Scaffold this active site. Structure first.
Site, PDB file in Angstrom:
ATOM      1  N   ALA B  72       0.695  10.002  -4.586  1.00  0.00           N
ATOM      2  CA  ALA B  72      -0.556   9.366  -4.210  1.00  0.00           C
ATOM      3  C   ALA B  72      -1.708   9.856  -5.075  1.00  0.00           C
ATOM      4  O   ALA B  72      -2.630   9.068  -5.379  1.00  0.00           O
ATOM      5  CB  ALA B  72      -0.894   9.712  -2.751  1.00  0.00           C
ATOM      6  N   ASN B 154      -6.486  12.145   7.309  1.00  0.00           N
ATOM      7  CA  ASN B 154      -5.373  13.061   7.288  1.00  0.00           C
ATOM      8  C   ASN B 154      -5.611  14.254   8.205  1.00  0.00           C
ATOM      9  O   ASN B 154      -4.638  14.797   8.754  1.00  0.00           O
ATOM     10  CB  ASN B 154      -5.072  13.469   5.819  1.00  0.00           C
ATOM     11  N   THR B 240      10.049   7.223 -18.034  1.00  0.00           N
ATOM     12  CA  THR B 240      11.368   7.002 -17.510  1.00  0.00           C
ATOM     13  C   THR B 240      11.388   7.057 -15.983  1.00  0.00           C
ATOM     14  O   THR B 240      10.754   7.905 -15.372  1.00  0.00           O
ATOM     15  CB  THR B 240      12.271   8.064 -18.099  1.00  0.00           C
ATOM     16  N   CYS B 327     -17.202  19.907  12.700  1.00  0.00           N
ATOM     17  CA  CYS B 327     -18.629  20.002  12.464  1.00  0.00           C
ATOM     18  C   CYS B 327     -19.382  19.965  13.793  1.00  0.00           C
ATOM     19  O   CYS B 327     -20.396  20.639  13.962  1.00  0.00           O
ATOM     20  CB  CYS B 327     -19.126  18.868  11.544  1.00  0.00           C
TER      21      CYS B 327
HETATM   22  N1  LIG Z   1      -3.877  16.377   2.578  1.00  0.00           N
HETATM   23  C1  LIG Z   1      -3.116  17.589   2.773  1.00  0.00           C
HETATM   24  C2  LIG Z   1      -3.620  18.748   1.864  1.00  0.00           C
HETATM   25  C3  LIG Z   1      -2.790  18.850   0.599  1.00  0.00           C
HETATM   26  S1  LIG Z   1      -2.320  17.216   0.057  1.00  0.00           S
HETATM   27  C4  LIG Z   1      -3.264  17.902   4.267  1.00  0.00           C
HETATM   28  O1  LIG Z   1      -4.090  17.406   5.009  1.00  0.00           O
HETATM   29  O2  LIG Z   1      -2.415  18.766   4.869  1.00  0.00           O
HETATM   30  N1  LIG Z   2      13.496   5.016 -25.939  1.00  0.00           N
HETATM   31  C1  LIG Z   2      13.713   6.447 -25.855  1.00  0.00           C
HETATM   32  C2  LIG Z   2      13.754   7.049 -24.428  1.00  0.00           C
HETATM   33  C3  LIG Z   2      12.375   7.081 -23.842  1.00  0.00           C
HETATM   34  S1  LIG Z   2      12.165   5.435 -23.215  1.00  0.00           S
HETATM   35  C4  LIG Z   2      15.032   6.827 -26.484  1.00  0.00           C
HETATM   36  O1  LIG Z   2      16.103   6.191 -25.951  1.00  0.00           O
HETATM   37  O2  LIG Z   2      15.226   7.642 -27.369  1.00  0.00           O
END
Ligand SMILES: N[C@@H](CCS)C(=O)O
Ligand SMILES: N[C@@H](CCS)C(=O)O
EC number: 2.8.1.7
Lengths: 363, 363
Positions: B72, B154, B240, B327
């Site tokens: 995300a 969250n 990839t 708060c």
């Molecule tokens: N959003 C997370 C903190 C690290 S992503 C949380 O609320 O626990």
């Molecule tokens: N085209 C690259 C891999 C990354 S897409 C390769 O096969 O050497």
């Protein structure tokens, strides 16, 4: 059926020990390493051991950073766009030197930066399929923010003059990046010998999983984050850690460097046996230098048969390889520690039979 | 020992069916999906099935995109920085509307954009712990490029209006992003009902693996890539494909929506039991509105013991929870999942109450 995998520069098979080491973090040790509770801190030893293997694998120092990314494509983008903002824009150093052989994760990104007004120099390849270090010296202006040269080429396996390129960049005060994905586990990689400021790698070219990589960043060198957000990776790259894959990539790095001798003395000899046998075929010839290459790669061209035709025929016999531009496309056969001599013999046979049949059909 | 996991808003356990569905791509089906040979094409059907589950999970249309990201945080950075380039810079719409409640993946990226000169209005939270749709209405100028409001908070679990906010953005011609990470598998998510142009998610908040996410992009909407390169993901996000985690995240999404009824009816009832029981403790109060919340979250404040003290005690008893801003200073965020049980909640009521009375007598 028994298929033969000879496309290891495109991706590799995960080492069974890498799968093994990853499993507990896909199961009961699922805590967020950023969590203050026991589920979170219990992951810290394994992550620290994974980081240590990564540092030692490329001779990074304790003061340097080895930042976990999601792939070498992320690392490359982060280097180029971070430097664009830090040096090209904020310091007026609106010039970058790179090569025409670079992976699309470097070249395509440079094309974007050029659309923003950055001057980009794509160094041409020589007859040997390589770059001379004199070329980077010629191209460096007082405006060059960064040089980016891949350590090894993915199509030909040819090793580039990194050490020298690094000395030139150091004597001129220019930042140096090397995309080293194809070198990990093929040749020794030493960031200090390279005098690299940045170095990229991707675990799935060395028997770790797809979707994780690394960016080495030298001590004191700055790089505006590509992922802003939480405080992960000393604030340099935000996002909840991919615990299983970090642990696996550490183990993959360790095993890669432990098998360096075997890669050169066993895998390289399988590559030579393969290549020598294929060069007794008439119109067959290696594309590029046969010296200064990583051990696992051969890129052969066949006088009248296209690369894709050989690839389609070869695939029918369950042998996997890929193309590589020739300068009509050539065949890249790329080995690993998992190939055997039986497989090379078989590939010699099937490759030869395919060659003779495709020529007879060609006229 | 029997540990109790109550920090599911921080990350979750991978569903055993998710791990199972991933394993073959960690073992013998390791091909690169971009490869033309058999090792690559053999991965296509599982990737297509995974994508389908993701689309159906959020009611994305065949003409829309669901792009695979590494988390995300990538999705959010990509939305905010791509819109900076496409609208703030290229169209002079140098203003963004978001909230003070957002995840740092949004706020901290916005702070970076403010350093570049973007005008960012962080809508203040009300006494209900929420924002109103009228606030975005008031704050939209003709210079507003983008509004970004998270679907569910969250820390408090509070659901934001979204449906109404999206209606306002569409009538005003403003791009709408919602960070929906906390909503998946907690409440139904319908991107068409939301009139969202962009929607972010991360697999590890719905029992998929860490280090894979998604960005829904509405058909026809542009967003300059954050990752330039190889032209994976219809050219929009290069690198990839992380095949095992894509297949795993698809199944995780499918399972999340199939468990929506259970989430509301059983998990919701367990959260209510915990919360009601903890309100029999004196001086205890839930932080925010107790209506229009996802089912799984409660955020309680205790008179004069801060959250961190309660967390340390709770952790000693192998119960995992986290803090949340209130708060005295900080509150305790308890977030359940389909893997918690009534026995765990009872045990947790017992341990939390004992912890409160003991820490008060020491205070
Ligand atoms: N959003 C997370 C903190 C690290 S992503 C949380 O609320 O626990
Ligand atoms: N085209 C690259 C891999 C990354 S897409 C390769 O096969 O050497």
């Amino acid at each position: 059926v028994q298929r033969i995998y000879l496309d290891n520069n495109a991706t590799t098979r995960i080492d069974p020990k890498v799968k093994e080491i990853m499993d507990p973090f896909l199961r009961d040790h699922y805590g967020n390493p950023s969590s203050l509770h026991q589920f979170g801190t219990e992951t810290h030893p394994a992550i620290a051991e994974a980081l240590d293997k990564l540092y030692k694998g490329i001779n990074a120092r304790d003061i340097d950073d080895v930042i976990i990314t999601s792939c070498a494509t992320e690392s490359n983008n982060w280097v180029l766009k971070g430097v664009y903002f830090d040096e090209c824009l904020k310091k007026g150093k609106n010039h970058i030197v790179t090569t025409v052989a670079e992976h699309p994760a470097v070249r395509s990104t440079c094309n974007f930066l050029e659309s923003l007004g950055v001057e980009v120099t794509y160094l041409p390849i020589n007859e040997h399929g390589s770059i001379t270090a004199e070329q980077v010296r010629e191209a460096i202006t007082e405006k060059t923010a960064l040089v980016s040269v891949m350590w090894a080429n993915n199509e030909t396996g040819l090793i580039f003059p990194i050490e020298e390129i690094g000395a030139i960049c150091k004597e001129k005060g220019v930042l140096f990046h090397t995309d080293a994905v194809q070198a990990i586990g093929k040749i020794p990689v030493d960031v200090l010998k390279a005098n690299a400021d940045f170095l990229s790698f991707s675990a799935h070219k060395f028997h770790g999983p797809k979707g994780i990589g690394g960016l080495y960043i030298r001590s004191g060198v700055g790089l505006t984050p590509l992922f802003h957000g939480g405080e992960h990776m000393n604030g340099r790259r935000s996002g909840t850690l991919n615990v299983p894959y970090i642990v696996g990539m550490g183990e993959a790095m360790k095993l890669a460097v432990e098998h360096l001798d075997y890669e050169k003395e066993v895998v390289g000899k399988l590559r030579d046996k393969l290549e020598e046998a294929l060069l007794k075929i008439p119109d067959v010839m290696v594309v590029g230098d046969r010296i200064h290459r990583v051990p696992n790669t051969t890129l052969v061209s066949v006088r009248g048969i296209e690369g894709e035709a050989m690839l389609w025929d070869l695939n029918r016999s369950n042998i996997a390889a890929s193309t590589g531009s020739a300068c009509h496309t050539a065949i890249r056969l790329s080995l690993s520690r998992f190939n055997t001599e039986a497989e090379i013999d078989k590939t010699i046979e099937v490759f030869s039979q395919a060659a003779v049949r495709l020529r007879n059909i060609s006229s």
